[PDB]
Design a protein around this ligand. Structure first.
Ligand SMILES: Nc1ncnc2c1ncn2[C@@H]1O[C@H](CSCC[C@H](N)C(=O)O)[C@@H](O)[C@H]1O
Ligand SMILES: Nc1ncnc2c1ncn2[C@@H]1O[C@H](CSCC[C@H](N)C(=O)O)[C@@H](O)[C@H]1O
Lengths: 119, 21, 119, 21
């Protein structure tokens, strides 16, 4: 769970997101794991919670792809190889020691307050 | 609510992607 | 994926099991991750592949619990907290640098040649 | 094969456990 590069929290003031002990720059692979690629139907139902679905199907977050919560300024994201198989976690915008690593969602998965626009 | 509502949806996804709308 | 303690293979002569770069002793937590606890039915079906089920239900291998292949002399195993929630990976019998980490199955999940007995 | 076969099974599990038969 804990790693010299980051740690899992379970934080003093955070839900279940990741903590960036670093120390990362713009474009740093913080971590990477495998995932599952299944179609909707019973899959989307039974796994209705931590499923990273793309425009074609719904996959599962094998590594720590689910723990990533939704933040207004996520300083870290992830990448996907050809399909929803290999999942990576880069650092969109350098991070400082003591930050929280998380990722956004997209059209689906709503956040809360529509305050992410300057228009 | 006083309007055309759509429960079912062919484009019903879950978590967006890194760069694939 | 790769870690100073172990690595994922994808090996020069191994399927998709884990590699013990260490260097471990008898009773060493090589790694630990979370898992999912769901009942049989559609769950056992859709996830019919990497499901660590106990005598009461069927759970999913969140961390690298599936990659563990079946070997005749697995020098590493795993542990389970109260229920199929937290999963750990200890080292049943010290391991040398360049070994393969894997785990057995049990009554279900058959291996191949019944050559695991001296009677 | 020339014997009582049982396809369904109430004790149908998947992967054994570390120490729980
Ligand atoms: N900024 C936010 N506001 C409200 N709810 C949020 C939120 N960020 C996350 N959540 C909720 O939490 C869910 C994300 S799953 C959270 C990750 C979880 N800790 C894990 O380990 O899997 C979403 O469905 C969302 O409703
Ligand atoms: N010793 C062995 N002989 C034959 N098949 C084996 C085997 N060890 C593993 N397998 C097969 O592989 C399956 C285990 S799943 C293998 C782990 C996979 N690399 C992963 O990442 O999830 C079993 O269903 C079994 O049929």
């Amino acid at each position: 769970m804990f790693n010299d590069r980051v740690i899992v929290k379970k934080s003093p003031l955070g839900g279940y997101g990741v903590f960036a002990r670093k120390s990362f720059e713009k474009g740093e692979l913080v971590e990477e794991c495998l995932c599952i690629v299944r179609h909707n139907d019973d899959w989307g139902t039974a796994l209705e919670d931590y499923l990273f679905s793309r425009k074609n199907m719904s996959a599962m977050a094998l590594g720590f792809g689910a723990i990533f919560n939704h933040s207004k300024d996520p300083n870290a994201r992830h990448e996907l190889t050809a399909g929803l198989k290999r999942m990576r976690i880069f650092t969109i915008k350098p991070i400082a020691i003591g930050e929280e690593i998380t990722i956004s969602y997209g059209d689906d998965y709503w956040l809360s307050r529509p305050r992410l626009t300057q228009n | 609510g006083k309007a055309p509502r759509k429960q079912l949806a062919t484009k019903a996804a879950r978590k967006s992607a890194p760069a694939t709308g």
